[PDB]
Amino acid sequence: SINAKLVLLGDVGAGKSSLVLRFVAAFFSQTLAVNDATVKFEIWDTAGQERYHSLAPMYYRGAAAAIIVFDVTNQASFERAKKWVQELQAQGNPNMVMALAGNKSDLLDARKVTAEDAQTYAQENGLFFMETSAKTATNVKEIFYEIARRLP
């Protein structure tokens, strides 16, 4: 039906790998079906450390989609999230379904980044935002479908 490549981007402490664990290692297959169309997901984890930043394009080469995670409780990763989508917007094939995920909202008051701050920037750049959480299984099942809905 549709084999599909998805890429996680974001730093360490964004916890993208803690994130996808709820969705069931560095790589995960997942055949997902929406509205009679069926999509197999090839999900690719990246090393979040700055010292590897320039390896990134070897991974998102030929990406059907990407998810950009950041840490809501530690501000600077939201900015790193900005540079990512900025880099994707430019280097990936323009027919790419991107998603922003703000992870570690699982702390009821530590959160440093507002829902508008995130919602507004995402809106501005052709993607949706979700408040992801691994401790409370929130927005993991959810986020993949919205992307599926949006694939050529």
């Binding site: 360490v12 560095a26 990246t46 010292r51 590897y52």
Partner: protein, 246 residues
């Protein structure tokens, strides 16, 4: 394989070897011929009435067999058959010979909670078995066996120290350390050989992934300077002299 009705395929698989090998080397043109040739034969094995009568492993057990025999005979024609590649093998080896003597987990961001006793010796020896196989498949296994070994000891450390299962934040850096410590000779060539001649339809999923990993491991290791391994431009260079002197 040598059944008194197979002669058709032999006269073809033999005749392609000659046709092909007698072409001056071109990495793009050559492998497009081979991946091109594999399909022709793919359909063929499955179409051939005398083979009713098979599952899906059995269809691959055939394809692997063709990938192998054929690439064996054509090895010295496809593997490091140009000069710019041989140099990249040399360049890398020199780099890895030296850096192995002084790199540590921190340089690459490997936390103590994921540091291993043996330095993942078992992973290193799997890569080092790479030039012991001529088939793109087998070569790949060396690599995947390295990756698994890494994950098990990595997964263990997560249980041992109560964390989650490991992602690319853990694998990519340990792969590098382990590639440098391992110095799997003719890497650059190796990774391309597999890239160009693994039955394209099999270089996919779990495999394609960890291959992109080791390919980006090569890249990184190729570009190593003080900053990429986080050292003073002094320490790093001094270490290079020491390593050179040893």
């Amino acid at each position: 394989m040598r059944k008194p009705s197979a002669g058709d395929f032999v006269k073809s698989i033999k005749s392609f070897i000659v046709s092909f090998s007698n072409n001056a080397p071109d990495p793009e043109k050559d492998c497009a011929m081979v991946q091109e040739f594999f399909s022709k034969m793919e359909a063929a094995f499955r179409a051939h009435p005398l083979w009713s009568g098979c599952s899906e492993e059995e269809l691959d057990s055939a394809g692997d067999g063709l990938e192998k025999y054929v690439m064996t005979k054509l090895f010295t024609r496809v593997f490091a058959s140009n000069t710019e590649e041989v140099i990249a093998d040399e360049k890398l080896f020199q780099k890895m010979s030296l850096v192995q003597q002084f790199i540590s987990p921190e340089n690459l961001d490997i936390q103590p909670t994921f540091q291993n006793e043996s330095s993942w010796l078992l992973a290193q020896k799997e890569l080092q078995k790479i030039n012991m196989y001529k088939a793109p498949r087998d070569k790949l296994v060396c690599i995947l066996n390295c990756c698994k070994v890494i994950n098990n000891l990595l997964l263990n450390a997560s249980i041992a120290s109560n964390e989650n299962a490991p992602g690319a934040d853990e694998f990519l850096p340990v792969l590098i350390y382990v590639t440098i410590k391992a110095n799997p000779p003719q890497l650059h060539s190796n990774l391309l050989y597999i890239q160009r001649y693994r039955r394209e339809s099999k270089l996919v999923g779990e495999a394609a992934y960890f291959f992109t990993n080791i390919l980006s491991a090569e890249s990184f290791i190729s570009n190593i300077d003080a900053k990429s391994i986080s050292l003073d431009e002094a320490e790093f260079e001094k270490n290079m002299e020491s390593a050179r002197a040893r």
